[PDB]
Design a binder for this molecule. Structure first.
Ligand code: CD
Ligand code: CD
Ligand code: CD
Length: 30
């Protein structure tokens, strides 16, 4: 059902020096 994050759906989300989610599937997260 995806229970880990809520970032949105379109082209780009950012994720740089500090994150406010649990782990995520993005660039340095997994
Ligand atoms: Cd996230
Ligand atoms: Cd993200
Ligand atoms: Cd993240």
């Amino acid at each position: 059902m995806d229970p880990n994050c809520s970032c949105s759906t379109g082209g780009s989300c950012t994720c740089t020096s500090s994150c406010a989610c649990k782990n995520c599937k993005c660039t340095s997260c997994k």
